[PDB]
Structures are given as structure tokens and as C-alpha cells.
Amino acid sequence: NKAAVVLCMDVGFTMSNSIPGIESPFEQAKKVITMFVQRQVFAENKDEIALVLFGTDGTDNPLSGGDQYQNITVHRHLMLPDFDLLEDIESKIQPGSQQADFLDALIVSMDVIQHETIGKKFEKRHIEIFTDLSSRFSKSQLDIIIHSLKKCDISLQFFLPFSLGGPFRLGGHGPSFPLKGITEQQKEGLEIVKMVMISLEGEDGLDEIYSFSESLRKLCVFKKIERHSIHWPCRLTIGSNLSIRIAAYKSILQERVKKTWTVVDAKTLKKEDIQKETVYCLNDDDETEVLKEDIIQGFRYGSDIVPFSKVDEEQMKYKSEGKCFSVLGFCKSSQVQRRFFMGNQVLKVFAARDDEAAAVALSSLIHALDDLDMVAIVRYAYDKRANPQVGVAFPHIKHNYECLVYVQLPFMEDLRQYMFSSLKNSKKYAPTEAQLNAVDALIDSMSLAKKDEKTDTLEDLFPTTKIPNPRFQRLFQCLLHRALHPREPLPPIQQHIWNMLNPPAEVTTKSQIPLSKIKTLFPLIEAKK
Amino acid sequence: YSGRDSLIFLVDASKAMFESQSEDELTPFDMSIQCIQSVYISKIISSDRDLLAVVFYGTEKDKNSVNFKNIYVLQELDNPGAKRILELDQFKGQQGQKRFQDMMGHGSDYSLSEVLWVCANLFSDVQFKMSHKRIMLFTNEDNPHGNDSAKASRARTKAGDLRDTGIFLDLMHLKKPGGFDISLFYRDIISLRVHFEESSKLEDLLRKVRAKETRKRALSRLKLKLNKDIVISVGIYNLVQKALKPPPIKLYRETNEPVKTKTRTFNTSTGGLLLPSDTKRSQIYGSRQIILEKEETEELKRFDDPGLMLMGFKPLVLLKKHHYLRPSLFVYPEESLVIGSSTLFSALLIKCLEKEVAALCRYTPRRNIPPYFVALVPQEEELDDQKIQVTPPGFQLVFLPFADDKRKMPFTEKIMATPEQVGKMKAIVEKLRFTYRSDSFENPVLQQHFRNLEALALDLMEPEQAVDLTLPKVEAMNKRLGSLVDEFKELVYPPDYNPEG
């Protein structure tokens, strides 16, 4: 539902100072807030936004009292953002000439959140703070802020220009800020925000804190306002005498935008004048018009098309029986292979909510499957309308819980077979040993994981599962470009998109020399495209 | 590739095939008729693109351009059709064989050389890209022309001629009370047991086969680049494709001819016909809607040229296997444009298998399409008992989700259970274990679609029953377990809580 979220940003000059060689925290914050605002606006969710800004040259605050609560200006209260807010963001957000303390701005933000929440149901409250921490401040109301958070339980997410802990990349893989560039005020603010967020949440709260550059790389900025989709309340079936009520959830799905492009007139600019229609006429008998109810389907059976209606099919077709979902057989996990995992989406199935006995039963099942390396084939039917499917589900235990994941499995009609040559016997394509060693060296210089010291875990230079789709970002960038200025051609793929899209250049530079090594050691020729 | 295929079927006209040692058993003529109808409908379902013919010999009448006596063709080499099915169907049964003997001749002498000649001639009468040879025969007599040794000589001469001209034959055993006794005249004129019986491969013909088996076709001809200039010829295939019902063929009410579709847009206020140029893409976000045209919309969708650029290497264990988005693809090395790419493919597969690391690679399937990140999963070549590959060599294609594709889940905690119950259903699963095989699970719903389709096409008396395998045989498992299910119910569930609400 509606989330009462407000964004607080300093309008000081400390972050607005032109930082040589690195984008200033003002510009980084502006980029991140523009991304968030365009995402929220083009999602058109029911969450409002208010404009709280401290450090402004003016002073307009609901709790202004001199010295304190100064340089704070509030323009728009918690209403749904529009394109006016976007044009003010790209226009009115300028380097300022006033400094203050962010505690007063947070206090007035929570005050207006509390005031304007009456008369409208809010799912939760949220606020995120963008500060460079390079300004002198008094640690007066931070504890009072924590106490108010305890009695309000407002979601908080923190983002700073400096990295929590090289190549110049925006949101990619590199140091967001050098460890020496932070001043004493920056370190003081870092310690203050660390202890505040520890008091609020803790270590997970520290994980909730990110950098200005790498915030675009992750959806954790939207993690506070996320809402899960619908689920499947049904019952597990084992034989006849055993059954468990379940609430299945779609774990991974290739999400698609709800909004599609319509058609408007070049002059009316509306769908009303446009009237698409479809015409069916007897092409054989000199385009003789055919009624939309005097029309029949058919199917090519053999070397001919057999006439066939529609309603007759559905009254003679196979009939499923509701949302049946029943296990079929028991097989070792080694028998199944990854390449046979079918189904577009990935489903996570769970029992009925808070059914403790069912939860214990399924947990014991999970443990038995894990110890036995065991999986079970299950037939799935969404409802009587759906064509029933079959597949397998396996248990997956995390550090905090255990998960059940179901995947669809194909049929013989789905299976495709082909004859492939034996590359081992291909003496015409047998590499030399030195070429093999060069390939190994290139892989080592190109490998993305090094065995971590002092920890048995394996490092990952490429956390790509937490990178969202950049295609949507480019869509939305070009969308706002057209909305603001429907005159000039569209912007191209900006470089920082590649920066959180490309690999870091360090591995590339490591592989440069072996790249030359193999491209020289391996003769090859190519034909014209 | 290999183009169209031709299958030709030969049955002698003689009273031996109209009679059986046991009258309960079918006649060879009737069993051949029902088997040929079965294989016709199976081929119609499966691979209807190819060419089939029907021809008879030894009759009292002849039908062929060569005008060789008693040589009567019935259906020439054509794609099978339901009319052919029915016009061969009415001759099945006792009355069918009676009406066949009435309107059609049966029982006469001939030569094998002349029937071979005319069948080769009609095979030559096809102007399609031939793929393979299949000229079936059906006889319970191994010595039909041993009376004239010159006839046997010319028959084996013409068989050598066909095998020289790239023609392949095959022989079907028919039941013989004295034993069919192959090698008396065959195994030398053609390309074991005397076979008193007949079932040698007909049992494979009688079983219903329903599939599509898409032929050897490359999914996409793609060029791979490592950094900026390393050019590699690669070929992408799929071992699995979602099977769908054939599209309905829209057609007229009465004449049932396929009506063509006309689609047009016209004005409302003006009433006149609109133009494609006037069409503008429009979406309404906020107060101000967005005016756009399609061409620049796919230009925005256009990001990069098709190609696979290596984004690095990651061990196979680091990726979580539950992350899938699509049926996995499979690439194979090519040497069409780039020469020597297969050597590189071999070297890299060997090195990666030694190092058990995946190969992350940015993926662009087609022009003006958004790119994507894929990891290359190597695959070995596994042979069967007869050293025939069961696991193709090459690389699998796994698909990794983005941040947004991972739907948020409601909070779930960890709950423990007694290890006694754990061992209890360990015993339960050990009771009902088996081994999965991929060749035992079809979609019976599509099978029933087809079943109704031939039922209406051939006016079959009943809608053929779909032999579903997705339904469990609940009685068997309940018998096997019995008093263990209520033991679980008492062990875990409270003895007052029904599983229902």
C-alpha cells in the first residue's frame, strides 16, 4: 500500500564543491535521487513524497526557531510526484551557500510524516539521507532521533558518497572513494552514522548502508518499499491419506513492464480517432465478405487441412480437475541435470502460513531429502483452466531458514536430438600443449574468483545477481529525455551505464598479455560476413 | 542438409497373405493393412513433410505407365493425406479383403526385376531433395522366382543396380508355417533364425508414435569475439524446445476454404482510412502522456551488435543452481566463416574442465535486442553401451537473473523436527524409490488433442483415450505404506487437526 517516504538532502556547498578528478557528492547524490525519482514516478506507485531540504539559502521549516532549524526549506508536502518535481530536480537543485545540521531536518521530516499520515492509510514510513558528512555538527538530537525511531519504527536506509570500507567506474567494481580523501569531519560523521544505524538495526543495518556510486548498481535502495506478488494457496498431495496445505510463491520471474505503447493520431494525438479493425472476406469468391461468426478454424492434418470448429474441441478436449498438485515419484538428485530444468519462472513453495505441524513435517522431509540427496517428481496444475505440468522440487537450507524450490520438467515432445562430432577424435583441431598452457594462463588472468584468505569462502568480483536490468534504466532515461524535451534526438548509451555494466579493467589488463599470447600462438583465418 | 524422404511399400497379391494357419490370427494382408495405416498416421503426426506411396503387384490387373502386367500402383509418392488413409482403410477386415478380392485382382505370376524397375522409376519421378531410401516389402515366401533361375539372376542384378544407384531396401518377415527361412534367396540380394514367426520390427511399427522431431537446423549463425578482434565461428543449438499445439487454420463457414485476413485502421471522426505513418506510440505516465514512434522505440531497444564477449571465469560451484530463467541452450564449435575455431573450443573445454570454472559471457542474440549475461557450462560427450553418444559434447548455456527478476519473498524462519521422523520418511522414500528416465513422460493433453484430431479426421468410432502417466497410482503407494501415514500424522500433527481448513 501507500508508504510515507521522504528524502532529505543537504543544499550546502561542501558536497557542492567541485571535486577534481572525482564526481562531487552533490552530483552523485543528484544522480541517485534522479534515478530513484524516475523509477518511482514511472512505476506510479501509491507512495507519496515530500520535499525537505536543509542548507538552503532560504529558510522555510515547520519547526524553525532561529539558529537551529535554519537553512531548511520545504517546498512540497507528501503528495504524489509529477513532472514538475522532475523539472525542479533538474533545475532548482543547485549548489547552495548555507550550512546547518541534518538533525533538525530529520526532526521536521518525521514531524510532517506524523502530521500528514492522518486521513490516509500508510503501509509504513521511510526516509533516506544523503550527506557527505563534511560539515560541523552538534551530536544533540541523534539519540532523541533514535528514541523517536523506537516509538515509531520507521524504515531507514543510509547512503553516503564515501565507500563503507583504483579504476574510475560509476557503480561498477572499484573504490567509491579513496580512504585518504575523507577528512576528520567525514570520519566523525561516519562513526556517528555507524553507531546510529547500529542502535537502530545493527550489522544488517550496516549492510543497509551503501555508497553513492554503487547504489544504482543494486535494488537495495528499493528494498525498503518492495512488495511481494500474489501466491498460490493449495494443498500438497501424497497418495490420498497425506496432504499439507501450501502457499507457493514465484521465486524468480523474468519481470515485464505492464505498460505498452498505444497508437495515436499524428494530429488528434488520441486513441479515439484511431479505429483499427480486421476484415475477413472470401478471397476465392472475389473478396466476398465473411461474417465474423461465419468463420471457422482448421488444422493441417496430413497433406490437407481438416475443417474443425472451436466449441466442439473444448467440449471434447482433455479436462483437468481444478488446481491439483500431487507428487509422483522418488529419484536421486544425481539423476537430474541442470540443462533439463524447464519452465520460464522459478517457483518457491511453502506451507500454509503459521501451520506449525505442517512446517515441522515439511522440515523433517527437508532433512531427509538432504541426507538422502533426494528429490521427488511432482505434477503441477495451476487450476482447471491451466494445462497441468510436471517437474521436481528440491529443498534449499539457508543460514536463517530452509527453502523449497520447484522447477518444471520437459516431455519427449520437448526433447530435441542431434548428431554432434567427437572433438576428441578431431585430429584436425587438436591444440598444442604450449597453446593449452597459454589458454590456462589466460583463464587464470581472466578468472573472477580467488580463494579468500583466512576464510573458506570464495570471493566474487562479479555479484551480478544483484544487478538489475540496465535496459529498463535506458528506457526510462530516454523516456524522461522525451518528456522534458520532445525536440532533440535521444541520448545514447551513457558511459557510466557501461561502467556498472562492464567488468573492471583490472582483470582486462591482467588478461591483455595472455590475450596477445593466444592470438599469436593460434593461427586462424576468417571469411567475409 | 538431407531433404525429403521417401518410403515405399510392397505387398504381393497371393492367397497365402489372405489366409492364416490360425483363423483367429490375422491374415498377412490384413495385418499389413492395419500396420501400414498405423505407420501412415504416425508419420502424419510426426514428420508429414516427407513422401509416401502405395503399390501392389501380382494381381489380375495393372496400373503403371510402364504397363507391366499385374503391376498396379495405388498411391504415388506423395505426402500422406487423410483420404489416402481412408481409401486404404475400407479394405481392412474380412469384408475389406472380400471387396478387395472383388474389385481388385489377386494371385498371379510376375517378375521381381520389373517391380523393382517400376518402383525405382516412380522414385525417380519425384523432383524433391531426396534424403534416404526405404522400400518396404511383405512376403511369407522366400523363393518367389526360384522356378526360373534366370529370373533370380536378373532380380539380383537389378538389386545390385539399385544398391549401385544409392538405393536401400529392407525385408519384413511374414509368418510362415514352414519357416520363412531367410538367406535362401536373401542376405545376398538384399542389403539368423528361419523365422516361422514374423515379428522382427513390425512391433516397433504398431506402437503409436506422436512427436514432431524437428530436423537438424542451426538456431543462429553467430560470431564470437573475445576482446575486440578475436573472431570465432560458433553454432547455437537447443536440446529442448517447448512443444505447442499447431495453430488453428482459420477458414470459411460453408466452403471451409481458408479465408485470408485483412487488417486496417481508419479514422473515427473523419471516418477515412488511416495511414501507417500516422501511427504514433503513446503511453500515459502521470499527467503528460508520452508521444513516440515505433522506429526510435526499437532504436532505444537497440543496444549492441549480436555477439558473445567473454566476461570472465567463475567456478561452477559459486553459482546457485536454482537460478534459471529459460530452457538452457547449447553451443557447438563451427568452422564456416572462421577456420580453426574448433581447435580453440577443444583447448578451452579441456582447460575449463580441468579447472571446473564457468565462462561468463555477455550475450546478444539478435540485432536491436537488449544484451544479457550468460555463463558457459561445459558438457562432455557420454556414450551408451554401444558407444553411441547420450550426452552431446560442447557447452550448456545457463541464464542468470537480474536483481529485479528475484521476486521478494515473505519472511520464513527455520524450524526443526525430530530425527526419528526424519528416519521415518527416509524409510518411506526408500520404500518408493525408482530411477528417472527422460523417455517416459509426455504431455498426454497434446496427445488427446491429436487423438480427437484423427478421431474426427477418419471418423473413428470412439475418441481415442489418452494414456496419461501424470496421475499417481495412489492405491499402490497406500498399500506399500499403510500404517506409516497415520504414524506421521500422530508424530507431527496434533491428533485433532485436519489438514483442511
Binding site: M412 | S42, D204, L432, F434, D439, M477
Partner: peptide, 23 residues
């Protein structure tokens, strides 16, 4: 050739769908 579809050259023979056989 054994192991190949007698009804379809270039394709393997397919054994009919069986379902399950518990142990």
C-alpha cells in the same frame, strides 16, 4: 541401424512412455 528410428532415418528409436516403477 539398431538404436535408430526405423520410421525415421537419422533419428533414434524411442521406447514407449512407461511412467514409474518403484522399488
Amino acid at each position: 541401424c539398431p538404436g535408430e528410428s526405423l520410421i525415421n532415418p537419422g533419428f533414434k528409436s524411442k521406447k514407449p512412455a512407461g511412467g514409474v516403477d518403484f522399488d
